[PDB]
Design a protein around this nucleic acid. Sequence first.
RNA 1: GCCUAUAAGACAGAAAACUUCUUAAAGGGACACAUUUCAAAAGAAAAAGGAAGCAUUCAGCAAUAACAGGUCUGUGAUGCCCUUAGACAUCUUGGGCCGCACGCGCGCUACAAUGGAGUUACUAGAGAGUACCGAGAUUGAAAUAGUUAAGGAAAACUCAAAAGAACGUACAUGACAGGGAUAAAUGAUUGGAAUUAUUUGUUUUGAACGAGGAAUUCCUUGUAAUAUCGAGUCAUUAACUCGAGAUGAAUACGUCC
Lengths: 135, 60, 69, 98, 181, 141, 151
Amino acid sequence: QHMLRVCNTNLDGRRKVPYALTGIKGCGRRYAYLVCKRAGIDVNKRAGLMTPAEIEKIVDILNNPLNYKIPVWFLNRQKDNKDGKDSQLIANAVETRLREDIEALKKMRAHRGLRHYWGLRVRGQHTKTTGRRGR
Amino acid sequence: PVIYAQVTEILGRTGSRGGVLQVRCDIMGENRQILRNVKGPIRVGDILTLLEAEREARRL
Amino acid sequence: KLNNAVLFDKATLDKCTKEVPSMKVITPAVVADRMKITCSLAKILLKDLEKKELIVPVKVDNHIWIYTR
Amino acid sequence: ITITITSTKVKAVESLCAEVKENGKKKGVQVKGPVRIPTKTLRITTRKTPCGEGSKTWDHYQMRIYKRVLSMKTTPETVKEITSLKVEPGVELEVAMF
Amino acid sequence: PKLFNKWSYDVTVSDISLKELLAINSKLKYQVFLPHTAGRYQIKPFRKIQCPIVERLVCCMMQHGKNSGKKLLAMRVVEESFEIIHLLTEKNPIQVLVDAIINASPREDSTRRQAVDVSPLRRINQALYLMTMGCRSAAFRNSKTLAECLADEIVNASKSNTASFAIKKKEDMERVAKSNR
Amino acid sequence: ALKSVQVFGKKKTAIAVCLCKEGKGMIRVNGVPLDLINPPVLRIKVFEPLFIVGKENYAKLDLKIRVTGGGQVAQAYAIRQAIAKALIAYNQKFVDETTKNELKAKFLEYDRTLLVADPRRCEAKKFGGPGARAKYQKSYR
Amino acid sequence: MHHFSNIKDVVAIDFIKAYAEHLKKSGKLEIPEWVDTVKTGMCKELAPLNPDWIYIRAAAIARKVYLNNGIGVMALRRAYGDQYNKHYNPSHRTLGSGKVNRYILQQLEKMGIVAKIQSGRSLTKEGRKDMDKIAFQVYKEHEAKVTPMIL
RNA sequence: GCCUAUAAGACAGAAAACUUCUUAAAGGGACACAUUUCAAAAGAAAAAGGAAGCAUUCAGCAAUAACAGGUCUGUGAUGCCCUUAGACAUCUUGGGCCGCACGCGCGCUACAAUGGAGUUACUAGAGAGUACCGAGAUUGAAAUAGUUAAGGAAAACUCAAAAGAACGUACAUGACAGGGAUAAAUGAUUGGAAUUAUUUGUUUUGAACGAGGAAUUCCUUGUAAUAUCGAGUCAUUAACUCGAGAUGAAUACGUCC
């Protein structure tokens, strides 16, 4: 199957398994290699050669990292607010968590949130010369 | 049809700046003197290749 | 623009094995262009055909692989 | 004993280097050879101008430190007695007892 | 001695304008075990002729900025290129490099235009420089390795082939100079 | 016993101090053999003087070489100087000079630098430029 | 010619290669929990691709203590380091991972291959003796496969 | 003392002899003298020898006269003018010099396969260090960093190399695993104080950029270029500057366009 499907995200099957899991917006490269070792799936294999009987483990292993021996400092979302202290960010949830967070500062009218509204450099950089997108 | 010639003496450099040398050559086929404009490094000992030997490069 | 495929098929394997040894110079850079397959696969066939002895190596190292008939 | 001499003038220490060695023939029998420790240049670079104007120019100041070490057995009480000899300005003499 | 303990120096040059200007076998020092000689060929006029012919090709493969000062890597490409070249023509790669230089060397240049002849030393300098452009450009963003990319350039320019990058340039200016008489 | 001759080779900064004495052609460079030099591309580079005059001359010489500076290519050239200098010194103090003369003439008939060090050194950096001759870019307007 | 006097008479990489199975066959090098969840230090962005990267690394460290008597973790961190080029600024050297390099040294103490001297870690009689025979196995393999340059 | 060899020696602890290398003093050593040619001459070129032959190379010092060039915001160098107890004098708290619709100058990183990524052995030079300065060694940690802590006022001790190379049936021409911008969580160091993120660690986020118009800069040999190291600033902070070594091009021996 040349075009795989997992956690609503389509990955190219012409690459190796670790380098096709990078298609998921919540999983990069270091995370991708770890789940390959955790799931007991060879890294040298291609993603488009893997049986579907194990693909359901990868979607499970990403949405349930605590039970599968993953260090807590490897998580893209640590110390989550509104209860819960686990990432659960390996999904299209990366954008969902990002937007509502910026609005939290905007609701409270923080300086970082205020800079987000104006589309300015948030992290305190020199805006005099660099970042000259036309407007 | 290319006929070579032997550089005999160097007359000087011309062509605005110095990038062309005027040398009087002789063709070893018949010992015929010829004057040509040479581009590049040249000295007395070496020879030159002339695909055309009907022109005289005296430059007026 | 190439899209030379990564997995093998009966079509090329029934034509690549009769003309690769007949070539004089065989290397992944020059062989992947003619049978329209990825040069990564050219590593597999060169070693696979080494077992059959159909192709004899003449320059093999960690940088380039050069084989001959 | 161990005589360590260091100064900014090469000939100041060198002249005194052989002054102790020659002096060792009396009230003693031998003085070890002069060890010439490598010199230590003190390079300081500054801008010539007192302001920002002008071209970018620098001057390369430097000062060299010459180190010589001597060894000698003798006696602590009568190594050189006075051990001053009215040493020239800019030179330093340090004696490592025992 | 041999260039890589594989290639001898029993090479001949057809024309007389380049026999003395190509360092092949006249002096023992031209036959060198490695194309890495640390001499000073750029301290006096007409001193670069003493450099080995294979040596002068190695240096041209060290250009375009990010490859500056990498001669060991450039030697590796040349060393692996001659083995490919030897197979492609069943002859000595040293012989193959020499005859390709004669064919790829332009014989006329135009100066601001005015068509003038080209000195034999400039013919050699442009000969290596023209084929080096093709290897550099063709191997850019291509699967073919630099050694093989350089390998096909020399053999094409060896006989007459128009597929050579250098051969196209040689006929290009000789045709432009034909319109600059 | 074990008559010895001490030589050294030089380069940009590499100093290749050798010690030639009676032996069996067992060359060790800082404890490693000459056949296992670090830059394997330059292996034939250091073995030319062995083939220049025949290894039989070096077949009974045991050289102990040490390198104390330079780079991986400066030391490669410094070794060659120490190898050629060692043979000349051995055939000078003990063996007749006429036999050494042919070896010396053969060495200088192929590579002069095999017995004389290259005097070139890194030039000092100058103010207003990134190197020894280069200068910072000039802007007028 | 060629002779064996110590392990400096063979190439470094293959001896460390042939020394990995010796640690593999012995089985006294246990596998901690962070073997796959860490990189070799600072500049790296990926964990080592070789599944047995510890065994080749442990053998490589065992060679370092053989050449140097008094060595430390800090002196080994710089040996196993790379260049830090994660931004636009020019790269500069950074030290390796102390934990992944001191862990191997501690384990090598239990095997008896190294001891704990006042100035770091140094080999023992069994440690010095063990690597010599393997250095001969590659030596005999090397001379049987390759032609000496002198000859 | 230890260990491997088939026969060489290796390593660890002192012991004591020399100076090829090392260091640093004194002299020696090229003056174009010696040959050929060219110009009664000052002189020029080849080649030889030589560590060294362009004034041997790179730098320092650097003539007379002048600018109404910059500096009175370096000076307890200074005239005149101005403010001179609600002060333009002095101190404290907070902010700004970082502010962005845009234009310009100096640079760093990239656009890749002469490469990025995973491993392995590497080879330098020249700097700096007190009572708390440079910090060794032992530990936990995934890293940033934490706890106890030798020796060192230093040829003594600390202070250490990557570009490149070797290793693999990895990558395979794909804005891909090139590029690391902008952001989001979180961990520490310095600081009395880090918000407008000081600096930096882990994971995720994966933007322009496919070699660059007119113009225009620097450069002739260990030079350019490429990548890096030390120091000045420094409680903490280089993409800067001043130096240092590591590989080592091409093109000229020319003319006033």
